[PDB]
Amino acid sequence: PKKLQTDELATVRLFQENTPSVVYITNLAVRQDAFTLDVLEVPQGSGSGFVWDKQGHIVTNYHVIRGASDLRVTLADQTTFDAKVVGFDQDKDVAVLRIDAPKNKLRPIPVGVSADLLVGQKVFAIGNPFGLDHTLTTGVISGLRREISSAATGRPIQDVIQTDAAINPGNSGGPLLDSSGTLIGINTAIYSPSGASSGVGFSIPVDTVGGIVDQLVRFGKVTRPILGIKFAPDQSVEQLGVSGVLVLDAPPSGPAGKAGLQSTKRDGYGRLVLGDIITSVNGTKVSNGSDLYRILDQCKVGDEVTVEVLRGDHKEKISVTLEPKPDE
Amino acid sequence: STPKKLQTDELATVRLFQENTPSVVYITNLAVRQDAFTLDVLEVPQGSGSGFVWDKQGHIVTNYHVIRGASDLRVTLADQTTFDAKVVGFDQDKDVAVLRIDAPKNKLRPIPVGVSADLLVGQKVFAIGNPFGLDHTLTTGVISGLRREISSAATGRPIQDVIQTDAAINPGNSGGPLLDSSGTLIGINTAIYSPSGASSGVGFSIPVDTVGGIVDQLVRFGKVTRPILGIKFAPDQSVEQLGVSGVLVLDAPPSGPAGKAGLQSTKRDGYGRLVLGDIITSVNGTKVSNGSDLYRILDQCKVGDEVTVEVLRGDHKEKISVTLEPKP
Amino acid sequence: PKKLQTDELATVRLFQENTPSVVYITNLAVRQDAFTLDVLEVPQGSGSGFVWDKQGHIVTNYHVIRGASDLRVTLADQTTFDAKVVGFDQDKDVAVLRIDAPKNKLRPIPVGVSADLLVGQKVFAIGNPFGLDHTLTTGVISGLRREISSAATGRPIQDVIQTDAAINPGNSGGPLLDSSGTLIGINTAIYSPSGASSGVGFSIPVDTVGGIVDQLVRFGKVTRPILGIKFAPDQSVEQLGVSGVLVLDAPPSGPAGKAGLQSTKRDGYGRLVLGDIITSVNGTKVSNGSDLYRILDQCKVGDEVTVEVLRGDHKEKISVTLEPKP
Amino acid sequence: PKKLQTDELATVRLFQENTPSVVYITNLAVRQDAFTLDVLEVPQGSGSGFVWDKQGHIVTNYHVIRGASDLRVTLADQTTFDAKVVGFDQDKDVAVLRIDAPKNKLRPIPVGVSADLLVGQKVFAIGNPFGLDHTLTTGVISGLRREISSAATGRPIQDVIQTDAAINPGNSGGPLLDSSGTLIGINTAIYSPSGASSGVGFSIPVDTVGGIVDQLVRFGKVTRPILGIKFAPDQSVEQLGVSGVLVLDAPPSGPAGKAGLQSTKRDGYGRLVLGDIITSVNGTKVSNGSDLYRILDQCKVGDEVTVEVLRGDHKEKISVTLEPKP
Amino acid sequence: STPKKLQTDELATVRLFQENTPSVVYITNLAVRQDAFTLDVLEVPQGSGSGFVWDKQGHIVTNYHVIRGASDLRVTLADQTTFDAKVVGFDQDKDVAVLRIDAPKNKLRPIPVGVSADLLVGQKVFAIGNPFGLDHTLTTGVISGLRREISSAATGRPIQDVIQTDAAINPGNSGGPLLDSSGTLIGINTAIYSPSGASSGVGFSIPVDTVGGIVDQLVRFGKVTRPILGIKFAPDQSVEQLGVSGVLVLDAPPSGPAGKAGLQSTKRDGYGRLVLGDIITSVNGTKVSNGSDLYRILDQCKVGDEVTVEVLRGDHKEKISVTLEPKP
Amino acid sequence: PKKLQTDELATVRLFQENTPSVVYITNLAVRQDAFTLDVLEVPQGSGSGFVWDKQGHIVTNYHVIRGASDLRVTLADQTTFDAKVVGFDQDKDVAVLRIDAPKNKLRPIPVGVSADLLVGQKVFAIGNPFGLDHTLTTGVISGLRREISSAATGRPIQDVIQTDAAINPGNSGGPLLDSSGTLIGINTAIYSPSGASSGVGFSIPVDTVGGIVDQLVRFGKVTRPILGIKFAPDQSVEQLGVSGVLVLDAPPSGPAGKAGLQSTKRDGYGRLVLGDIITSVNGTKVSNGSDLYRILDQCKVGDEVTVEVLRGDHKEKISVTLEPKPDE
């Protein structure tokens, strides 16, 4: 060994201390034997995750787990285990797994704080892009409080972290650490016309992660509020000079339904009779989908939200009490 | 929660960013369009980019390709307030443009002006812009190369002295600042080399030394006056067949510097046969093998100069004097 | 400058001091003038490399040189020289060149050590991406001991260094240096759906390069041990369904054949007379080839190694002595 | 007209007389209004067919009907009717429909004979290519007894008539008539790299259609003999290298299993325990399936047929009795 | 060698061809272009097509899409002599055009004019043209269908009464004759339906009955006068969203027939909201479900006619009289 | 059987009488055994041919035979034979094969005459498109005396027959018969943007075929004259107002070489010194490649052709005696 400089030494260390907490995740799919006609389990995906606690809980992106007839997590030392799906939140693309492993081979990553992050501080991403086990890439926090389309549901994910640390396919589910060797986010997606890292990557912030992992380990589900309306996307509403959100449907069996919000119908000659248009929700104004989403993201089941609509050419105000989203 | 002590290196990048992001702006290129349903005149964004604040008088600098073809321009300040921007002037060849905003002198932080002539490969650089609409994104890198010549199809005419960096630069970054570790402007990010159209680690910035000169001239006279030889010539991969080792002058307007001086254009003998004209083979002693060489030479010239251009005419060369004049 | 930081100052110095050792390599092909139709030489591709010693030996990837009528290397001061091929190793994509030039123009690149590298340390890549003469990109060692498929032709390369320092077409053959300004690897390939840099580049370790250059300089080729076996790909060992490397042909001359390995055959009808199937080599369990290769990749010509095959519903152990390919 | 020629005059008459029997078939799917989001029915595809009898039975290709919420047939006079599916045979892409309409609006198409057809005779195709209501194209019988892969799903169709009368998407289900103005086949598919007509269209022979319509009308399905075997494709019987149809699974219930055919298996390790392999069925030599299929395609449920397999370096002959698929 | 006795059927097709090929011509569409080397004005073919001789006065008929955008036209007679052609006039809607040639009256064989109204499906047809430049190619087929309506993007406005044939028709055939077995003009080949852009057995011809009328009018007055309602309407797949069961009139110029009569255009209430206008639902009693229906209706109308158009306006229909005027 | 009409009966008959003369040809290529590592013969192409004589000679397109490690011809009754390549002419894409077969299973097609063909007479094509054995397609002669690019060499093939009888991949090498049940051409290519029959197909005329088959059976080669010059293609000569054919090279060892025609060279400064330009060849004028080709197509080895060139701005006349093209 040669004498390494301060800085690089700090990252060399940070990596050795934390790589043990990172794991490889395999999404095995069912395939047929061309002759045996029976089945064989065979990898259709690769991703990462980290150890959350001594009880064998593993965190990752839900999109990495989606559709796996079976999934196995490989730990640092290469010992591979079978994993049970503890639970998951599709909106924030967070998922929790559990494995039966000896507490000695489990390092839970030190949990940090994402609320105090500053653009410019250094970050460290560890994951498995292209199957390269426990790859380290470094960069900087490029941005904070970003909103990105979930695609895991389409619903927007608020408060996302942006980094220019190389993030490629296979990094999803792995950790983003700060200079303190602390977890600040889960690497989950990128913006790139090629599908290759283009220097713009996103991580779900640790703060929203920790809450979700708690709820997931306790109840195996996260309960989120709904208004009970299907609205028109910002696009197919563009050509109507529509200020806010056009409710297309408010099922009689949901919150806005029981609260009497009107849906969009048809003239009898076939013309469109616009349903209510949400222009504001208790205080905060709503000009499009993101605004609505963002605002409800702050509510909890049971809250009595006061929503303002633009009904037949005259304003309105309606109180709706948010109920949990129907299960399945 | 209290922030964690950051290392000195990263802490610096954090200061540089707090200090300069406010000087960065977002620019919107609007163009007139037909309303689909009421067939009226509508204003609609067709592209966006970056820029920075130059003086307390409201002068915004950006790339020309950003404001090009614009019907109307809006610049949005860091604090999200937006102003209408007037085109002070621009230099299509060096892809630089100045805009004027009527905003409060306190909402305007001129960017520290640096020096590009003494930069060294390996120096740390900082890019701030709006790649993919991501507001004031900070990406970090190093100076990868100096004195690069990139042929910007955004004029055609090549550009030289350009800075090369491996800080991530993506669509949306054009027009934003490139800072040195001292937090001073050293270039304006304008293009990249990429098969994908996305950052691949090879980005270019027009050097501050070139920009200072141009902004100065645009503010003071509304234009940049550049000399011309007054000829239209055959692009390289067009005469590469004939073995032409220079610029095959296609047209020397009798009205321009080269025509009034006697250069002979290409011509057909009515018999169909192509009787080519003068072939420039050097100007002020500098060899001219391709159109770029000619360009580079003129780059270093001033209007009113008496350049001596050599030409291969009818089996012998011969030097002719041409007096460069301003572009009309 | 306006007072550089210590860290950036170190980069500045490192580039300043080593860019002289890097070179530009232009691979010229023979073409035909389209009007006169006389033959002429024109560039087929370009890459980089670096100076190895005061004798004028230049190192780069073999894939930079493959299929080139003539080779020309341009030194940092723009002066060019015709280049002779001293030798090259296809399996490790390393090639040595020799140019005839002024000893005061050759700065041998300081040679480092790759066995001690640690993930996270700073690296420096110098090369000519996109024709961008002596570009410097910077990153960290992202992974060590990686195994990437023959970035030239076939056999897996072992011990590959992974880095997120921007590496692009044109960087092939150039040096990857550590913070001590020493050669730790040769930038040679990348993983990318775009074909350009996306953060994962690989470079062959200097330790491996040191050896091969040395050999090439002296014997103009490097001797490698061979088993004397031809086998089926990991994808053809699937449907048949078994862990191991199936022997498809053991030339009676090639060691494995001397020893008694049986090749695959076709019975009177047409079905498969399943020749041997290697499942272990003197210890290590083989099962695909990345294995058989990986392991065998550490033997020397001569090393009598025991190979565990399988044939009659029973396993067996044959003793084979390694020889070199001719 | 200005005095038509006898030949064109015959075409004119033939179309004039039979276009009444052709119909338009629109396949409607369930969709969602994008603003009101109530469900609605909208066209998924269209095809043609023809009237079979005064009861309102309509004949077309099953592939014209597959996956349709509701079926509507439009008669030559533009009047439409909802259609009920009477039955259909997937292997011969034939389907019967029944509509409720005026007997004075149904012209049963004169039914011809396909067994006597000769290459070179004139044919007449009527259908709705590209929505072109009752288009008439003309050509000759280009080939007889052709075998084209299941223009619906799987099994080869036999006895297919080939023609160069322009056949395009939309013609599927329509009649192909001979010069006697009689039904000789159902236009069902084409060979084309463009996806549109290039001169080789195929239509299932009326003899085959006559039978299936009849069956469907009565039992609402047609019974077919099955061997009770699952086998590998002609492309997986390649690498192993042997003429024959390899048995991959003989369900102990399915006749072949009752008889004692052994399926392919995997030995303790993972290699292939090569189950049986059919090389002949009571006479005809099988070797791919187009064969096994072709042959077996002429048996009736019950027909005890001897099948020649192969297992222990020797051939053997098992007696199997055909049953129908449930 | 002596020719072999041909069958009567084929012998006829051989006569029909000997007799008519001389009346067929080749047409060249030349356009002005920049000479690459001497940057001068050059004449250069950009497309070719077919046509036929109409009278001894040198009138050539062809499709309009063939001569469209032409800078200069040359027609080549069967005997390979070529003449410059002047545009007599054309009807963009029925894609028909007449040209005039100054050639010797003996080199001109007018084509026999037939009748298209009494054609029958199954009749034998003969097409002569220049597919892919193949001089006076003869292709044979049958009349496949009558009264077809094809929407020629070569105007947009649909065309009706069109003949469908399975005689091979390929690029290069446009503008050439379609003959019946009596050797008389019955249509002019103009388009085909094909995924490949090449004959797939579905070709269309504009019927002779429509052509006779148009050529006549073009020769006599240089133009075809067609009526207008004076409205610009919303294309179908544009309002299909609103449930509009007719033509949603977007604009009724106050200067035109529909405006002077009172039809109301679509409009936004400055509040952004899209307040749509009249929706035509029938004209002279004929239902109007889509733009084509309206087109077809007007097709059968004459200028100066007082058409009564029904409109869905503010919850009720109401018939309004409009007096059709000539196209400007 | 039903009573068939005159016409169809004639074709039914023609087909049964001649289908026996048609054969299927298989182009087997060498492929490896993934395990055996030895070789297997495996079809890479399919085409047709017909029996030329009782001695087992089979005719086909050369392009069908090109590159076959082995080729086998299947006769009517399905008996497949191994075939020896008697010889071939690449210019006219004609090839002759020989097989060892019992004279009783060999019907040589009746040879007709192509010189008297008339556009409009009926034709019958028999071949194997898409592997459909002995497919019959009928149509008409659409054109005569056409010139098409050989692609088998690029050299143009003169005097080609055009038919609208469906001709697809797999028809090459099969016969085109006239109503007399006589061979009038070999189906060999088509014009189609899809690769599927588009109604424009070509056959090499029987007259030129018969000569070539004779020479091929006698000497196994056809001897064709050459001028001994490589010229510039009509394209890369376009921009030079070049009237005729620009000779690029006239090797000193060939006819025009020994006769002293000049090649194109380079100025010494790199400019182009045009070699001779052929404007005429003994009588007939030459304006481009096709003209030259076409004209030499009429000469025989040994002919002393007088060629006119445009040398350095003054005309010329040079006698060249054509020599056989060097073998290989």
Domains detected in chain D: 1-109 (2.40.10.10), 110-224 (2.40.10.10), 225-326 (2.30.42.10)
**Cα separation of C139 and C198, whole Å?**
12
DSSP string, A27-47: EEEEEE-TTT-SEEEEEEEEE
Q: Checking DSSP bridges between strand C315-321 and strand C323-324, what pairing results, if any?
A: unpaired
Q: Which two tokens stand for residue D209?
A: 């259609």
Residue B100: CA count within 13 A, CB half-sphere: 11
User: Does residue B180 belong to the interface with chain C, where contact is any CB pair within 8 Å?
Assistant: yes
CB contact under 8 A, D240 and C266: no
Three-class secondary structure of residue A293 per DSSP: helix
DSSP string, E160-196: EEEEEE-S---TT-TT-EEE-TTS-EEEEEEEE--SS
Q: Which of F203, F125, F194, F192 is nearest to F165 (CA)?
A: F125
**Cα separation of F254 and F321, whole Å?**
10
Q: Which of E270, E236, E258, E86 is nearest to E156 (CA)?
A: E236
Q: Which two tokens stand for residue A317?
A: 């105000």
User: How close A230 gets to chain D, by Cα (Å)?
Assistant: 10
Q: Which residues contact E33 (CB under 8 A, 6 or more apart)?
A: E41, E42, E43, E44
Q: Which of B124, B151, B127, B153 is nearest to B138 (CA)?
A: B127
**Cα separation of A279 and A263, whole Å?**
15
Has B95 been annotated as catalytic? yes
Residue among C36, C37, C248 minimizing CB distance to F35:
C248
A–F touching, 3+ CB–CB pairs within 8 Å: no
Q: In chain C, what residues touch D266 (CB-CB under 8 Å)?
A: 241
Would you mind telling me the total number of residues written for chain E in this entry?
328
**Cα separation of E191 and E169, whole Å?**
8
User: Does residue F33 belong to the interface with chain D, where contact is any CB pair within 8 Å?
Assistant: yes
F256 and F319 Cβ atoms separated by less than 8 Å:
no
R_g of chain A computed on alpha carbons: 23
Strand segments (E) across E137-266: 137-150, 159-165, 177-179, 185-192, 203-207, 227-228, 232-233, 247-251
Q: Per residue, what are the HEC states of D234-246?
A: CCCCCCCCCCCEE
Q: Which two tokens stand for residue B237?
A: 């991969």
User: How close B313 gets to chain F, by Cα (Å)?
Assistant: 11
End-to-end CA distance of chain B: 64
Q: Which of F289, F306, F301 is nearest to F326 (CA)?
A: F301
Which residue in the block uniquely carries the two structure tokens 């390069």? C209
**Cα separation of D166 and D162, whole Å?**
11
D105 and D79 Cβ atoms separated by less than 8 Å:
yes
Using alpha carbons only, what angle is made at residue C192 by residues C188 and C196, rounded to the nearest 5 degrees? 70
**Cα separation of C49 and C99, whole Å?**
12
**Cα separation of A230 and A234, whole Å?**
13
**Cα separation of D6 and D179, whole Å?**
13
Q: In chain F, what residues touch E9 (CB-CB under 8 Å)?
A: 7, 122
Would you mind telling me the total number of residues written for chain C in this entry?
326
B238, B239, B244: best mutation site toward chain F, by most F Cβ within 10 Å?
Answer: B244
Strand segments (E) across B185-313: 185-192, 203-207, 227-228, 232-233, 247-251, 267-268, 274-275, 279-282, 306-313
DSSP string, C179-192: TTS-EEEEEEEE--
Chains in contact with chain D (at least 3 beta-carbon pairs closer than 8 A)? A, C, E, F
Would you report the helix, strand and coil content of chain C in percent, each value rounded to 5? 15, 40, 45
Amino acid at D274: L
Q: Which two tokens stand for residue E272?
A: 């952004």
Q: Is F293 exposed, middle or buried (0-12, 13-18, 19+ CB in 10 A)?
A: middle
Residue among F122, F194, F196 minimizing CB distance to E10:
F122
Q: Which residues contact A276 (CB under 8 A, 6 or more apart)?
A: A246, A247, A250, A261, A262, A309, A310, A311, A316
Q: Which residues contact E83 (CB under 8 A, 6 or more apart)?
A: E58, E74, E75, E77, E101, E102, E103
Q: Per residue, what are the HEC states of F12-55?
A: HHHHHHHHHHEEEEEEEEEEECCCCCCEEEEEEEEEEEEECCCC
Which H or E run contains D64?
helix D62-65
Q: Which two tokens stand for residue C202?
A: 């690989």
**Cα separation of A11 and A123, whole Å?**
10
Q: In chain A, what residues touch D232 (CB-CB under 8 Å)?
A: 34-35
Q: Which residues contact D78 (CB under 8 A, 6 or more apart)?
A: none
Assign residue C247 a region (left: φ > 0; alpha: ψ between -120 and 50; beta: otherwise): beta
Residue among D119, D182, D194 minimizing CB distance to F15:
D119
A150, A156, A157, A161: CA torsion to nearest 10: 90
Q: Which two tokens stand for residue B320?
A: 């002719």
Q: In chain F, what residues touch E197 (CB-CB under 8 Å)?
A: 193-194
C170, C175, C177, C182: CA torsion to nearest 10: -160
Q: Which residues contact B118 (CB under 8 A, 6 or more apart)?
A: C1
Q: Which of D158, D298, D286 is nearest to D224 (CA)?
A: D298
Three-class secondary structure of residue E324 per DSSP: coil
Phi and psi torsions of B128, nearest 5°: -120, 130
Residue of A48, A172, A263, A280 marked catalytic: A172
**Cα separation of A191 and C166, whole Å?**
18
Q: Which two tokens stand for residue D82?
A: 């909802």
**Cα separation of C204 and B284, whole Å?**
48
R_g of chain C computed on alpha carbons: 23
Which residue in the block uniquely carries the two structure tokens 């420096």? C124
Q: Which of D181, D179, D180, D171 is nearest to D201 (CA)?
A: D171
Q: Which residues contact A200 (CB under 8 A, 6 or more apart)?
A: A142, A162, A164, A190, A191, A192, B131, B132, B134, B137, B168, B170, B199
Using alpha carbons only, what angle is made at residue C111 by residues C14 and C199, rounded to the nearest 5 degrees? 60
**Cα separation of D183 and F182, whole Å?**
33
> Dihedral sign, CA of E213, E214, E220, E221?
positive
User: How close A224 gets to chain C, by Cα (Å)?
Assistant: 37
Query: Within 10 Å of residue A300's Cβ, how many Cβ atoms?
Result: 10
**Cα separation of F26 and F70, whole Å?**
8
Q: Solved how?
A: X-ray
Using alpha carbons only, what angle is made at residue D156 by residues D151 and D159, rounded to the nearest 5 degrees? 95
**Cα separation of D197 and E202, whole Å?**
9
Q: In chain C, what residues touch B181 (CB-CB under 8 Å)?
A: 4-5, 8
F174 and F137 Cβ atoms separated by less than 8 Å:
no
Which H or E run contains E62?
strand E59-62
User: How close F95 gets to chain D, by Cα (Å)?
Assistant: 26
Q: Which residues contact A21 (CB under 8 A, 6 or more apart)?
A: A50, A51, A107, A108, A109, A175
Q: Which of A325, A93, A86, A100 is nearest to A220 (CA)?
A: A86
User: How close A246 gets to chain E, by Cα (Å)?
Assistant: 12
R_g of chain E computed on alpha carbons: 23
Q: Which two tokens stand for residue F15?
A: 């087909």
User: Does residue F243 belong to the interface with chain B, where contact is any CB pair within 8 Å?
Assistant: yes
Which H or E run contains E296?
helix E291-299
User: How close A294 gets to chain D, by Cα (Å)?
Assistant: 23
Assign residue C115 a region (left: φ > 0; alpha: ψ between -120 and 50; beta: otherwise): alpha
F186 and F109 Cβ atoms separated by less than 8 Å:
no
CB contact under 8 A, B121 and C8: no
**Cα separation of B261 and B254, whole Å?**
9
**Cα separation of F112 and F123, whole Å?**
12
Phi and psi torsions of E98, nearest 5°: -115, 140
Q: Which two tokens stand for residue F108?
A: 């040589």
Q: Which of B144, B103, B106 is nearest to B122 (CA)?
A: B144
**Cα separation of E134 and E158, whole Å?**
30
Residue of C63, C164, C178, C203 marked catalytic: C63
E133, E136, E137, E143: CA torsion to nearest 10: 120
Three-class secondary structure of residue F132 per DSSP: coil
Has C93 been annotated as catalytic? yes
Q: Which of E45, E51, E57 is nearest to E101 (CA)?
A: E57
E49 and E30 Cβ atoms separated by less than 8 Å:
no
Q: Cα–Cα distances in Å, from D255 out to D75, D249, D260, D308, D318? A: 46, 12, 9, 15, 11
- Chain F stretch 260-299, residues whose beta carbon is closer than 8 A to a beta carbon of chain B: 266-267, 269-272
Which segments of E115-161 does DSSP mark as H helices, in order?
Answer: none
- Burial per residue of F294-310, b for 16 or more beta-carbon CB atoms within 10 angstroms, e otherwise: bbbbebeeeeebebbbb
Q: Is B203 exposed, middle or buried (0-12, 13-18, 19+ CB in 10 A)?
A: buried
Q: Which two tokens stand for residue D29?
A: 């799917």
Q: Is F244 exposed, middle or buried (0-12, 13-18, 19+ CB in 10 A)?
A: buried
Three-class secondary structure of residue B41 per DSSP: strand
Which H or E run contains E211?
helix E208-221
Which residue in the block uniquely carries the two structure tokens 């072109």? D132
Which residue in the block uniquely carries the two structure tokens 């009787």? B275
**Cα separation of E202 and B277, whole Å?**
54
Q: Which of A37, A38, A94, A48 is nearest to A71 (CA)?
A: A48
User: Does residue F124 belong to the interface with chain E, where contact is any CB pair within 8 Å?
Assistant: no
Three-class secondary structure of residue B33 per DSSP: strand
Residue B69: CA count within 13 A, CB half-sphere: 11
**Cα separation of B318 and B282, whole Å?**
10
Using alpha carbons only, what angle is made at residue A257 by residues A253 and A263, rounded to the nearest 5 degrees? 120
A111 and A57 Cβ atoms separated by less than 8 Å:
no
Q: Which two tokens stand for residue A319?
A: 């109180």
Query: Which residues make beta-bridge pairs with D39?
Result: D32
**Cα separation of C71 and C80, whole Å?**
10
> Dihedral sign, CA of D212, D214, D215, D219?
positive
**Cα separation of A106 and A58, whole Å?**
10
User: Does residue D78 belong to the interface with chain E, where contact is any CB pair within 8 Å?
Assistant: no
Amino acid at B180: D
Phi and psi torsions of B236, nearest 5°: -40, -70
**Cα separation of A269 and F207, whole Å?**
73
Q: Cα–Cα distances in Å, from C46 out to B147, B165, C63, C186? A: 20, 21, 10, 16
Residue among E7, E10, E198 minimizing CB distance to F194:
E198
Using alpha carbons only, what angle is made at residue C179 by residues C178 and C181, rounded to the nearest 5 degrees? 75
Which residue in the block uniquely carries the two structure tokens 């992992």? A213
DSSP string, D112-149: --STT--TT-EEEEEE-GGG-TTEEEEEEEEEEEEEE-
R_g of chain F computed on alpha carbons: 23
Q: Which residues contact E101 (CB under 8 A, 6 or more apart)?
A: E58, E59, E60, E75, E83, E84, E85
**Cα separation of B141 and B124, whole Å?**
6
Q: Which two tokens stand for residue A190?
A: 């990128």
Q: Cα–Cα distances in Å, from C144 out to A133, A136, C158, C184? A: 10, 10, 10, 12
E138 and F119 Cβ atoms separated by less than 8 Å:
yes
Phi and psi torsions of D147, nearest 5°: -120, 105
C–B touching, 3+ CB–CB pairs within 8 Å: yes
Q: In chain C, what residues touch F232 (CB-CB under 8 Å)?
A: 35
Amino acid at C275: G
F102, F103, F104, F108: CA torsion to nearest 10: 130
Helices (H) and strands (E) in chain D, counts: 5, 22
User: Does residue A146 belong to the interface with chain B, where contact is any CB pair within 8 Å?
Assistant: yes
Query: Which residues make beta-bridge pairs with B27?
Result: B49, B75
F282 and F305 Cβ atoms separated by less than 8 Å:
yes
C15 and C169 Cβ atoms separated by less than 8 Å:
no
Q: Which two tokens stand for residue D15?
A: 């179309």
User: Does residue D238 belong to the interface with chain F, where contact is any CB pair within 8 Å?
Assistant: no
Which residue in the block uniquely carries the two structure tokens 């599908």? A195
Has C53 been annotated as catalytic? no
Q: Which of B65, E98, E193 is nearest to D132 (CA)?
A: E193
**Cα separation of F180 and E111, whole Å?**
32
Q: In chain F, what residues touch B245 (CB-CB under 8 Å)?
A: 269-270
**Cα separation of F87 and D13, whole Å?**
53
Query: Which residues make beta-bridge pairs with E151?
Result: none
